[PDB]
Write a protein that binds this DNA or RNA. Structure first.
Length: 672
RNA sequence: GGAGAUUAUAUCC
RNA sequence: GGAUAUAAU
């Protein structure tokens, strides 16, 4: 409707549409339309009964996709990291073992960029059989699992109410629209989702449901646009560090993740319907990961689960294990059946009882559209052409974390219920009432990342069984990697969102594995040398100074970068990352202030105390203390009190650390 | 040719 | 009311 109107091709089958597309095919990072990027996907889909993907009959004269290419090939941190590991490993208990374990990770360190010619093979992961619905036994279990969380949410105080359309007015809609992508409106001049003309368009796209609902509440049929309104979804490849893996010998360089950039109109509908229920779960649902962070008291849902399972010890007091589910490529494989159970449960938690009959019908039409649009997407493939995608989670939707987390939680509870009805004398209702009590404190998911206590199965009179867990997931087309799913009784192997917990004599302390740091460093492409030096310090911040080996290694790398730090001169990249420092030290961001900061940078050290202050919560019992440049350019001194356990970690040398982890059996935190 | 959502945190305005 | 940066999913 905006001059970009699509034309209809003549064919119907994918193989014939593909031939038709050649007639539109077109530096090395400008976009060129290329229908051959679809060849393998079309070939794969042709052998499937119910494929997740078809070529769209409708196409645009001009595509939205942009070109790309490979990153800078140099890896400037690999050599300094090796010297640092060479030195610090000598102060650990097994120096040659540490250096070998660490070399494995450095070798895998890599990096992905957006490039249409490397992105299209990743899309094959999204091309497989649909699972529209599951069989009777599984459905009964999944609907019982829905009652578990619905009960949990009510007990936790859920009082979320349906919004009125007053909140779809431009001035009120702003409070539930975050800044970000204009999606397909970027072609029309919009730069941000929160731009006033976009906000006006998103508002109109919500208010149009009012009169549609008036008709349905009178028993008339809905307007036609309700069932046909669609928005284009754009795609691109993720730019990030990513570790290669060794699969059957060959070291497999990483394929870029497939990212979806959804339309602001779809965003506005999702947020109008479900912003509140999402924020209620973040604040109050103990199984809901989103809201988590590693510092400042934000890991409490993780720590509460661990402390219920370990009660002060380093191994679980009973033998009850902890399970960390390892699922292959969650977003590509989340089927329509699981998406429906998840979003339906979320919509059910929203209280509609105060709505008028028109208001209720209006919300029903809005939900109808949001559900259909989560399930069936119109996606511009990196070939430069539209395809239709049924199921899969479109990573980048408003619903991504919310629905992935809800679905993973429903999987394990549905599985538990399914086993109980088959194997024991519990009914669906009876298993549900047990799990509703036991799930509070025994389960947490963050999308496909999951951690749960075997007590979920204990209270059903069952023991966890990974093959039965994998078989349940396979009913939804998902592959639980059984040999990579950690099952343990030891705190040192418990993980959540890439974080470990170390129990010190004064309490728990979030930490991170060393191998993850080494791969990221080995994968870092060459930037401006000041930018890269500040990246190494950002890594210190990410690790929060808990581990003195990690601090030592990073402090070594930081020093080593000083030899060549000034070789590029004061570039614009270096100016940008030094601006905050120049204004806090000299009052201005002018050339001389910036160069004074620049030339002093070689003289700075990042204080481990500043890093460990990040464990301090902002509690009204704790004042964490301002950091200024303490963890970036290092030109302020951090004054402030650490938490007891973090104070213990400051007083703790490489040598004391390895001894304590050895004596407590917590050395699992270092690797994996 | 000049790269999504969500969460957490830090810095500066 | 905004900007920049890193991490996680």
């Amino acid at each position: 409707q905006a001059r970009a109107r699509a034309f209809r091709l003549k064919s119907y089958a994918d193989g014939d549409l593909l031939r038709e597309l050649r007639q539109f095919d077109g530096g090395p990072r400008a976009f060129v339309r290329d229908s051959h990027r679809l060849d393998a996907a079309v070939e794969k889909a042709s052998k499937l009964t119910d494929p997740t993907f078809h070529i769209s009959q409708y196409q645009l004269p001009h595509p939205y996709s942009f070109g790309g290419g490979p990153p800078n090939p140099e890896r400037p941190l690999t050599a300094p990291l090796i010297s640092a590991i060479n030195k610090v490993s000598q102060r650990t208990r097994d120096p040659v073992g540490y250096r070998k374990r660490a070399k494995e990770s450095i070798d895998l360190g890599d990096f992905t960029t957006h490039d249409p010619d490397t992105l299209h093979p990743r899309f094959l992961e999204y091309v497989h059989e649909r699972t529209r619905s599951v069989d009777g036994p599984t459905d009964d279990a999944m609907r019982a699992a829905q009652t578990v969380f619905a009960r949990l949410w009510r007990r936790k105080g859920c009082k979320v109410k349906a919004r009125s359309l007053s909140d779809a007015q431009p001035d009120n809609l702003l409070a539930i629209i975050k800044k970000g992508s204009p999606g397909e409106y970027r072609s029309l001049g919009a730069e941000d989702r929160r731009d006033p003309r976009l906000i006006a368009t998103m508002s109109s796209s919500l208010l149009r449901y009012a009169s549609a609902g008036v008709q349905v509440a009178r028993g008339r049929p809905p307007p036609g646009w309700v069932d046909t309104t669609t928005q284009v979804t754009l795609t691109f490849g993720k730019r990030e560090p990513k570790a290669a893996k060794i699969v059957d010998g060959v070291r497999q360089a990483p394929v870029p993740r497939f990212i979806f950039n959804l339309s602001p109109v779809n965003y506005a509908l999702a947020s109008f319907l479900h912003y509140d229920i999402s924020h209620f779960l973040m604040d109050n649902d103990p199984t809901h990961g989103p809201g988590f962070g590693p510092g400042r008291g934000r890991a409490r849902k993780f720590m509460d689960l661990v402390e219920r399972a370990f009660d002060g010890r380093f191994s679980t007091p009973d033998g009850a294990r902890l399970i960390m589910s390892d699922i292959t490529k969650w977003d590509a494989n989340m089927c329509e059946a699981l998406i429906k159970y998840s979003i339906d449960l979320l919509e059910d938690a929203v209280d509609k009882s105060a709505l008028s009959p028109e208001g209720l019908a209006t919300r029903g039409l809005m939900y109808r559209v949001a559900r259909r649009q989560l399930l069936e997407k119109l996606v511009e493939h990196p070939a430069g052409y539209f395809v239709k995608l049924y199921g899969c989670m479109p990573s980048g939707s408003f619903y991504t974390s919310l629905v992935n987390t809800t679905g993973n939680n429903l999987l394990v509870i549905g599985h538990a219920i399914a086993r109980a009805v088959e194997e024991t004398s519990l009914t669906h209702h009876g298993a549900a009432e047990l799990l509703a009590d036991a799930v509070d404190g025994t389960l947490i998911s963050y999308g496909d990342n999951q951690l749960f206590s075997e007590h979920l199965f204990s209270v059903l009179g069952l023991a966890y069984d990974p093959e039965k867990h994998a078989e349940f997931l396979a009913r939804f087309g998902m592959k639980l990697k059984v040999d990579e799913t950690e099952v343990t009784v030891k705190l040192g192997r418990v993980r959540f969102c890439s974080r470990s917990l170390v129990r010190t004599p004064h309490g728990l302390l979030i930490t991170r594995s060393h191998n993850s740091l080494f791969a990221k460093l080995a994968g870092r492409p060459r930037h401006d040398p000041v930018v890269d030096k500040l990246y190494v310090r950002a890594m210190m911040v990410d690790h929060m100074g808990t581990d003195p080996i990690v601090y030592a290694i990073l402090n070594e790398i930081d020093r080593s970068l000083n030899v060549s730090l000034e070789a590029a001169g004061l570039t614009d990249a270096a100016k940008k990352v030094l601006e905050d420092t120049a204004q806090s030290m000299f009052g201005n961001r002018e050339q001389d202030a910036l160069l004074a900061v620049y030339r002093a940078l070689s003289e700075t050290v990042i204080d481990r105390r500043a890093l460990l202050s990040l464990h301090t919560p902002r509690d009204g019992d704790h004042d964490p203390g301002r950091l200024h440049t303490s963890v970036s350019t290092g030109m302020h001194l951090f004054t402030g009190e650490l938490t007891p356990a973090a104070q213990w970690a400051y007083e703790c040398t490489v040598e004391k650390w390895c001894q304590y982890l050895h004596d407590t059996d917590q050395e699992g935190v270092m690797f994996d």
